[PDB]
Design an enzyme around this catalytic site. Structure first.
Site, PDB file in Angstrom:
ATOM      1  N   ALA A 156      20.665  66.968  47.317  1.00 11.34           N
ATOM      2  CA  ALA A 156      20.652  66.654  48.744  1.00 11.34           C
ATOM      3  C   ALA A 156      21.715  67.425  49.520  1.00 11.34           C
ATOM      4  CB  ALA A 156      20.826  65.146  48.968  1.00 11.34           C
TER       5      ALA A 156
ATOM      6  N   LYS B 107      24.040  77.150  44.817  1.00  9.57           N
ATOM      7  CA  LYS B 107      23.657  76.030  45.653  1.00  9.57           C
ATOM      8  C   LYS B 107      23.000  76.589  46.904  1.00  9.57           C
ATOM      9  CE  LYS B 107      27.051  73.634  47.157  1.00  9.57           C
ATOM     10  NZ  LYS B 107      28.244  73.797  46.295  1.00  9.57           N
TER      11      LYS B 107
ATOM     12  N   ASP C 122      36.705  62.313  50.598  1.00 10.29           N
ATOM     13  CA  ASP C 122      35.532  61.829  49.880  1.00 10.29           C
ATOM     14  C   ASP C 122      35.724  61.973  48.378  1.00 10.29           C
ATOM     15  OD1 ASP C 122      33.111  60.580  49.676  1.00 10.29           O
ATOM     16  OD2 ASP C 122      31.915  62.372  50.071  1.00 10.29           O
TER      17      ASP C 122
END
EC number: 2.7.11.24
Length: 347
Positions: A25, A44, A139
């Site tokens: 995602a 990626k 994060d």
């Protein structure tokens, strides 16, 4: 162009023998052989210009990854895109291949105390460099920690990072927050926008608890459940800590909760190294102003076989600016991304 279980993945001449790794995602990721360096790498694929938030965090991430250079932070070896902004549809990001991450490892493997020590050390060594650049990751979590087969560790996924701003941190009660719930410091839910370095330290503390037991220490199911999970283990805040909270809504909420006693760490982790529980405690301190810093954590006795401040580099070029990316038309975003990736174009 070539196929990988669906979409186009033309990574050009230099990268061959593709193999799907998982559309996670944040694009579609494949491994491939880098014919110039003769190593298998990770690629990626991004298609960000179809929504602006995807663009700002692609831009932020590239600029950060490109300026950073540190053993414990994933780099960018290459960026593949079209030679013109008209033709640039997709962006490919090439990085060192990493066989696993700590999330995948935690599901399957008991970590020895030596592994926990070494992983913790490398997280903090990399985080020291990040904070010295005035950057907050925001994060940090096991799936954002990549490992190779020799247990070398590299922080990734700077999509939520910002330049620190401790003076403009305060906000109201229960203000929305993007980063992964389980690793949010308690002050996110109370009065903080997460513009302070101690936000990352809480997250690392959570990772450390998770390394000791293979399970998230505070698995909140919704925004406020996260706070009640923290309070169930740390216990009710002290009056001194409550007096630091000036927003009435945050404070009166805490005041309304019934009294909870601390759960002793050696009850939660009766197997753990006691030095490790001591550092856990200073990392999982309710009050952000009392939470230990990255450099004192590195100097903690649990890490002394690794501690070496002369081998724990800091950044040369701090970000002395938050990137003013929120009020930018999608056309400015695309062009700044083009410009930031020109370094890898032949010529």
């Amino acid at each position: 162009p070539e196929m990988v279980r669906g979409q186009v993945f033309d990574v050009g001449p230099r990268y061959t023998n593709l193999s799907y790794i998982g559309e996670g995602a944040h694009g579609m990721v494949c491994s491939a052989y880098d014919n110039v360096n003769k190593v298998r790498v990770a690629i990626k694929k991004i298609s960000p210009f179809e929504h602006q938030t995807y663009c700002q965090r692609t831009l932020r991430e590239i600029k950060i990854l490109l300026r950073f250079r540190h053993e414990n932070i994933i780099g960018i070896n290459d960026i593949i895109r079209a030679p013109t902004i008209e033709q640039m549809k997709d962006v490919y990001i090439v990085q060192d291949l990493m066989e696993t991450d700590l999330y995948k490892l935690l599901k399957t493997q008991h970590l020895s105390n030596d592994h926990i020590c070494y992983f913790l050390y490398q997280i903090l060594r990399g985080l020291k460099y990040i904070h010295s650049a005035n950057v907050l990751h925001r994060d940090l979590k096991p799936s954002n920690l990549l490992l190779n087969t020799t247990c070398d560790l590299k922080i990734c996924d700077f999509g939520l990072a910002r330049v620190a701003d401790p003076d403009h941190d305060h906000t109201g009660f229960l203000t929305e927050y993007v980063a992964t719930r389980w690793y949010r410091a308690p002050e996110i839910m109370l009065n903080s926008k997460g513009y302070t370095k101690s936000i990352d330290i809480w997250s690392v503390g959570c990772i450390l608890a998770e390394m000791l037991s293979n399970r998230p220490i505070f698995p909140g199911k919704h925004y406020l459940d996260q706070l009640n999970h923290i309070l169930g283990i740390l216990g009710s805040p002290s009056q001194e800590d409550l007096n630091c909270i000036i927003n009435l809504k945050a404070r009166n909420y805490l005041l309304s909760l019934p009294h909870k006693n601390k759960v002793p760490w050696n009850r939660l982790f009766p197997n753990a190294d006691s030095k490790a529980l001591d550092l856990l405690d200073k990392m999982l301190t309710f009050n952000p102003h009392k939470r230990i810093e990255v450099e004192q954590a590195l100097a903690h006795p649990y890490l002394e076989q690794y501690y070496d401040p002369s081998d724990e580099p800091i950044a040369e070029a701090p970000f002395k600016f938050d990137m003013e990316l929120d009020d930018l038309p999608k056309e400015k975003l695309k062009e700044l991304i083009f410009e930031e990736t020109a370094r890898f174009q032949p010529g």
